[PDB]
Design a protein around this ligand. Structure first.
Ligand code: TDI
Ligand code: TDI
Ligand code: TDI
Ligand code: CL
Ligand code: MG
Ligand code: MG
Ligand code: MG
Ligand code: MG
Lengths: 273, 273, 273
């Protein structure tokens, strides 16, 4: 019974990838999601699409309701969440237009709730300490990696995403610092989205698309809103094709054991009185 | 006139270490403490015990009322605060079950008030900039170190605690990063507890107990709630014995000069109009 | 039509540098500024002075209304904002009393709005991602540097400011860590002041004055409120003279192209629906 949540990021807020589309606005105990859920199918696989920033990109990264978004997808029955995220490259070999199937993060966010279990919601009682050693589902990641290869897409098989609070871009001193820390790409949205997915027992993976070299690299176009959007206009089709081709493979794979183990990890992370 | 505040952490929320126990719920200008104060004695030394997370461990690290807890202990007349804190080890030589008498911290918290002087409480007026060069009382630390030796306990005489916001555990990229920064142990509660104690002119020290190797070290059991609680079940007695044996020594030592200097540092850190 | 906003920091809250002073309390959509605007002149150049902490230094760094302060200065017609900031030195060669014309920052703040565009103010609609590759105006910085030389003042031509949340000073482990990161000076106020200035299309520069060596350097007086204020009492005249001599030079320079480019950068950083 797989059902794939898709969270569309910058330049991919509402990708025309689902057949048999039906719009459904929902509510959650953590408030309204960013926008309507878009229910549909890719081949015979049920999907639920959601614009991270709203379909008109009106919500800045700090104000995205990550709890509501993940809650809504889980409540709709999603077993997996595969997302897109635009990002800056911190490595020469990760070129604008490249995809990075990230496997780690470094949190630089400051303003964001990272748990459903805040002691104020009867829907999630207790104190939850979710493990983050392996934040992304390696089985989903492996299907994304193999599919990118079949599509002939420049794709990096791992990567560490530094997530900054924003909405400003980083200073040059910060950009260089993140490089010394071993971060490979930079964005504003991976945390706490990945964390809440893990608490929900969902297989989560991220299609990171490099759009710029932040501001560390000489003789490159400086990061700006226009530069990010231009790179996505040129390359977003690659993410769309990757989703379209990956999802049927996920639908034909066995997931019960993977999902059971995630459910157990999430369940045993909650300390009750 | 020494009086010892004891803040019990994970696996030590309400240790049966006090004789002549009396429960006392209090209020403060910063709200209610985590739980009732437990008044009692160790030998002839007055103590005040307080569960950091509540005695049923119902309060997550971000939501702990650090201001109320420290305010309540100070108002009850505590000259010292000695705490327990479970932690992950970031160093091969700090094994689960080891005690670390930490002497430094690196703040990674984001959500927490760190001062009594926020411009909104008539009980603490002015702008306070407390020094943090020596965050922990070295005289109290030295008694803990010497007592641990007398007890034959594996104990490290110093250490830098990185305090993360939580409630999630760290990613592997974060865990490795904290190691490059020179942090020795990792927790979610040292900051701002140590900071507020200093503002209150209290001699503060911390008994850190390693419960796991976070997620950096191969061929070790991964950090999880169950793994932390299991290690504490096995080793909490060591912290209990250390408190029981240390406190009488503190009670027989001269503290007026130490306390006067702390009072002065706290007093001179407040800039009034 | 240049008009110079001056934000006075610690030890320089209300410097007697303006002729023809008129006090003007204003309001903004983000609340009240720290204090009254002080309108006046230096030679024939219009200025607007504002105490960052209030003229009685009653507002701690976390509670400073950076949005209101920058909004008020922009609304009064300021083309430039030149500020003073006291700071700790993280480098042997930056001595207490030295000026540093900082050119980069590393953000360690956690509690502060960094944008006017938070989705809640009709005065600033949209999602704004301001570039921070060059956070400070290099043309203003160059005039400050050349003027400091003409005055014979010990002045460093660049520097990376780490801005901590405060109000506590850093621990020793933190102080050493910031040195490994390549930060040169440390304060509590550069972020988000510099960020909001950029969003407002204002030429912003900072006169950083070292007052101490934080707590990393042996055989120096430990940072404290008294030590900072003492160094500023001795050296604040240098910042005052630098402002007084710089501002007339700014007034006689051509700025239309510089200001146009800043306006464009700010304008194109806003994504509308
Ligand atoms: C409409 S452009 C801004 C959006 C794109 N997001 C990702 C991103 C691309 N390049 C980045 C960089 N150099 N640093 C941090 N983030 C990013 C961030 C924001 O949501
Ligand atoms: C009921 S277990 C979770 C509680 C124990 N606290 C300390 C701690 C042990 N191991 C840690 C690690 N690897 N990283 C961060 N913190 C810790 C954190 C939390 O209050
Ligand atoms: C009244 S003294 C405190 C004020 C001076 N500000 C700057 C500063 C000087 N030395 C610093 C250091 N070692 N670390 C961080 N900041 C500073 C901070 C605060 O507003
Ligand atoms: Cl950080
Ligand atoms: Mg290849
Ligand atoms: Mg030994
Ligand atoms: Mg915060
Ligand atoms: Mg010189």
């Amino acid at each position: 019974a797989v059902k794939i949540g898709i969270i569309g990021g910058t330049g991919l807020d509402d990708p025309e990838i689902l057949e048999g589309r039906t719009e459904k606005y929902v509510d959650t105990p953590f408030g309204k999601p960013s926008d309507a859920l878009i229910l549909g199918k890719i081949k015979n696989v049920d999907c639920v699409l959601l614009a991270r920033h709203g379909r008109q990109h009106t919500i800045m990264p700090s104000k995205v309701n990550y709890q509501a978004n993940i809650w809504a997808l889980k409540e709709e029955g999603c077993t997996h969440v595969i997302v897109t995220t635009a990002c800056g490259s911190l490595r020469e070999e990760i070129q604008p237009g490249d995809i990075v199937i990230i496997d780690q993060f470094i949190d630089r966010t400051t303003m964001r709730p990272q748990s459903f279990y805040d002691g104020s919601h009867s829907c999630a009682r207790g104190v939850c300490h979710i493990p983050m050693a392996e934040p992304f589902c390696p089985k989903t990641r492996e299907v994304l990696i193999e599919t990118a290869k079949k599509l002939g897409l420049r794709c990096h098989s791992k990567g560490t995403m530094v997530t900054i609070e924003g909405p400003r871009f980083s200073s040059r001193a910060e950009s260089f610092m993140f490089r010394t820390w071993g971060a490979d790409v930079i964005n504003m949205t991976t945390v706490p989205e990945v964390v809440l997915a893990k608490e929900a027992g969902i297989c989560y993976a991220s299609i990171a698309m490099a759009t710029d070299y932040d501001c560390w690299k000489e003789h490159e176009e400086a990061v700006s809103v226009d530069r990010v959007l231009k790179t996505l206009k040129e390359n977003a089709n690659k993410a769309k094709s990757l989703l379209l081709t990956t999802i049927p493979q996920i639908g034909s794979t066995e997931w019960s054991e993977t999902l059971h183990n995630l459910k157990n990890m999430a369940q045993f992370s909650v300390l009750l009185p």
